[PDB]
């Protein structure tokens, strides 16, 4: 299926991640459908996370099982939250 997950960037020991939608079979750092938001795993700045919640709701709408620790970053941005 199409999945929403993370992709490594930034040097060795200095990880970053692009939360992105790609085909499950793709390579990790490989070409992807669309970048939604980044995420610093160490918070070296105030901007240690971000999510284009507009389209994120979209892919879940068109079905797109995301990772576990990918869903996590989505709960913090609370794409699922509604009240």
Partner RNA sequence: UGGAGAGUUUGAUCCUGGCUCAGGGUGAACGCUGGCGGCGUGCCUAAGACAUGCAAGUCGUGCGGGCCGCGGGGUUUUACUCCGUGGUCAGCGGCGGACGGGUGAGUAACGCGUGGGUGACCUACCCGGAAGAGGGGGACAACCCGGGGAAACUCGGGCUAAUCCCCCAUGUGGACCCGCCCCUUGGGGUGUGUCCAAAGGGCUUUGCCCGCUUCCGGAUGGGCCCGCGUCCCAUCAGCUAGUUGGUGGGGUAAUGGCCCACCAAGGCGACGACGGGUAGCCGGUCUGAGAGGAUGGCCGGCCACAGGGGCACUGAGACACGGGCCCCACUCCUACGGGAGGCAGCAGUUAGGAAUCUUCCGCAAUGGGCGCAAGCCUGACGGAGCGACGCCGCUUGGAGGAAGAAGCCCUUCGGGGUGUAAACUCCUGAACCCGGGACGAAACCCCCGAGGAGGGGACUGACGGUACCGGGGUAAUAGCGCCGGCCAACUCCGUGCCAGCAGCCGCGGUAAUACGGAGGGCGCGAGCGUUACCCGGAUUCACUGGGCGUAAAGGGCGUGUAGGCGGCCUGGGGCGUCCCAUGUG
Partner RNA sequence: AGCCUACGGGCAGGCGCCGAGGGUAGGGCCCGUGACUGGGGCGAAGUCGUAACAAGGUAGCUGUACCGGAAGGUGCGGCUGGA
CB-based burial, 12-40: b 16+ in 10 Å, e otherwise = eeeebbbbbbbeeebeeeeebeeebbbbb
13 lies in the site for RNA, by CB under 7 A: yes
Residue 80's binding partner out of Mg ion, RNA, none, with CB under 5 to 8 Å set by partner kind? RNA
1 lies in the site for Mg ion, by CB under 5 A: yes
Residues that bind RNA (CB under 7 A): 1-3, 5-8, 11-13, 15, 17, 23-31, 33, 41-43, 61-65, 67-72, 75, 78, 80-83
């Amino acid at each position: 299926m199409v999945k929403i997950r993370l992709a490594r960037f930034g040097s060795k020991h200095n990880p970053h991640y692009r939360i992105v939608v790609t085909d499950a079979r793709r390579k990790r750092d490989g070409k992807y459908i669309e970048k939604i938001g980044y995420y610093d795993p160490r918070k070296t700045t105030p901007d240690w996370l971000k999510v284009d919640v507009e389209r994120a709701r979209y892919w879940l709408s068109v079905g797109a099982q995301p990772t576990d620790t990918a869903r996590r970053l989505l709960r913090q941005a609370g794409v699922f939250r509604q009240e």
